[PDB]
Amino acid sequence: GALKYLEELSKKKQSDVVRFLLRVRCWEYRQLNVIHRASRPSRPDKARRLGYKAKQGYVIYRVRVRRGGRQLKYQRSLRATAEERVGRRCSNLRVLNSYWVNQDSTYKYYEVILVDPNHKAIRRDPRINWICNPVHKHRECRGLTSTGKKSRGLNKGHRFNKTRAGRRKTWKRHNTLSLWRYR
Amino acid sequence: HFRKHWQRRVRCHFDQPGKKVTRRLARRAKAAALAPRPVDKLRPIVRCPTVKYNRRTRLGRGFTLEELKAAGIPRLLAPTIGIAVDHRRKNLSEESLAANVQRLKDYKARLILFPRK
Amino acid sequence: RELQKRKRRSSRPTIRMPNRRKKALNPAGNNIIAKSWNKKETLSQNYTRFGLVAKLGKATGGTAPGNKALL
């Protein structure tokens, strides 16, 4: 039950223990490259609930992206650009999910979970072999990850009329003149 | 009301009879696979929500677990013998429960269930 | 368009695709339905002969006078 204790600890990010660990770890990541492989998740509870397993084929890449704005505001998220850059470096892998690990005042740090679709362990195992299908190539580039779903507005209700089922597709549907044979 | 470029989004339904034949052939394909079975699934009787339409009934999505148990049909066997199950709908009144239970017993009277293997 | 013109200009043969279909349109096998199914009739016409019901839903239009497969 160690992960339930980790869930509560990650809720208190300003506590003395977590603030201390985040301060030292922020300095360490800054001495490393912008994109580098992490041998192990720094938040094992968060990685686990996002779909990470300790099999051969699961990797973590952590990345820091410069924060701020372009007064223009990017419609995608800083988390979206973090996933997209990691996917380009690991072009053979499939991005599964990503999570926040640290912020700092100049950057913003995320850890990305990736799955290898050409590994036998992934292909033989269900629950993950759906990602082996070609319809899941570069999900982060198409907005198919958790961040992209939030940015696109794929929620049900009267507050999401214009953007669920595709914003552009809905506009085309509403702006198409349909003429039948017997008018 | 043509202030936008309407000409590039104009859909003409010249395939209306072609799609009907395609739809009729797809229905025939289901009967080809499920040869003795019906091509649809039994659906319950529900009341329309609004006060404008509450005096009229229609077909729902699937049968409630309570009214499926009152009929005498197990949960895990119902989707297998051609009955739709809806786990989201609640009864809230004996009138809806009785109407759909009677519908299920009428379905059981007309059923021909074959041995498994 | 340029590909189509190139093929008409070329000496390579045209690959005529046979009309293969994903789903079969008639029952097959050695069961009662397959041995009694008439390929030239419709779904309702075949089920009406069988004495069975084809659609458990609501009738969405007018049927033939002798139809007995639509409830």
């Binding site: - | 895990l76 297998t80 051609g82 007309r110 269930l113 | 019901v53």
Partner: peptide
């Protein structure tokens, strides 16, 4: 397929049925 999926199909497979007119 998953083992839990196989168990469900082992004991609850699709049957053959008909409805009288």
């Amino acid at each position: 397929v998953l083992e839990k999926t196989k168990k469900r199909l082992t004991h609850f497979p699709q049957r053959k049925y008909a409805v009288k007119a």
